[PDB]
Amino acid sequence: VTLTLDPDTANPRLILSLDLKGVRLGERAQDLPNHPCRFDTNTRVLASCGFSSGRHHWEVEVGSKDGWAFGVARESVRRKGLTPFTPEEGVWALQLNGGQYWAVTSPERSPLSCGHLSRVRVALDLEVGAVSFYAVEDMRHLYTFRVNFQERVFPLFSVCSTGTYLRIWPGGLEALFQ
Amino acid sequence: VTLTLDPDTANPRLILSLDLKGVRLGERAQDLPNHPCRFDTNTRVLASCGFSSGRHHWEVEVGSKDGWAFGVARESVRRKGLTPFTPEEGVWALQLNGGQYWAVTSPERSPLSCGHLSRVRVALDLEVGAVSFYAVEDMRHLYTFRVNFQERVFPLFSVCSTGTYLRIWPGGGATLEALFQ
């Protein structure tokens, strides 16, 4: 079965698509049951399935404008209260913010060298300890985080502004410097 | 046919552009004639054209810094003395203040997680009773006030600090944006 988004993790301001494969930010909080896995402040949602071993691919269709971040998270990522969006919190992600694409390193983010992004392939390797991101149009390498994950790892999605979105699929300006 | 700011309504601290499309806050009050229509304390200005029926669109280019608010006002909005900037006083507006975008509801404003704004389309519908705001780059919906307007309604603009501006176009902070990521 393909990955879907887990409604029990979803921040109540998010709207998950009917097919549970897309996420955007709504204008009001839904009245959802309190759940210990639910992100109650940060605008995050996990996939239905997490991985403790092996190699795993999925793809992410990304909105053209600011507000999204996605990647993977350790299962122990904190759900309760306002939390930082940083590798220290067990989140390893790409982000579109300020009109720029970033790998969310810390304390400073790392700007990506890439064209406009539309579809990104995520390659999670729990045997080696890495998560890698590729732009599908030309298979350009965007970023690799090397991490000894040491627990179960979940696909992670976040949308903190309206006017953008993320959608999950099965696997399969640099010109300023001219 | 296209909207222009009305200098006789403008608070004397405001500076209007020559083409009457833009407004910012000056550093001194101009010596302008008293008129019952002039906002003498709040930093407001209306367009010269108001609407008692029909549907009407215009667009507003907005500065990136705090200090502006814009939308529509009922004609009877109070002009004299310090007045509240609230729907009860007949103003229905978006605002950039404290690094956040707001729909100016009352008693508490409504924070908008809309991302950065550059230009906003205002859709005034006096036939159904609504005023709606959209970000022009994708027309994402920002806010709608549903109001049984009972009088003539005017485009409204306010700028209460220097370093920002509003500008009318024809109908056709930064790192707090991702705080909740």
Curated annotation (Swiss-Prot), chain A:
**What happens when you mutate S158A?**
Complete loss of interaction with GYG1
Consequence recorded when altering C160A: Complete loss of interaction with GYG1
Where does this polypeptide localize?
Nucleus; Cytoplasm; Golgi apparatus
Boundaries of every B30.2/SPRY domain copy: 1-170
Top-level taxonomic group: Eukaryota
Q: In which tissues is it expressed?
A: Skeletal muscle and placenta, at lower levels in heart, brain and pancreas. Isoform 1 is widely expressed with high level in testis, kidney and heart.
What does the similarity note say?
Belongs to the TRIM/RBCC family.
Q: What does this protein do?
A: E3 ubiquitin-protein ligase that have both tumor-promoting and tumor-suppressing activities and functions in several biological processes including innate immunity, regulation of ferroptosis as well as cell proliferation and migration. Acts as an antiviral effector against multiple viruses by targeting specific viral proteins for ubiquitination and degradation including norovirus NTPase protein or SARS-CoV-2 NSP5 and NSP8 proteins.
Quaternary structure, per UniProt, is: Forms homodimers. Interacts with GNIP2. Interacts with GYG1. Interacts with RNF187 (via C-terminus).
* UniProt name for this protein: E3 ubiquitin-protein ligase TRIM7
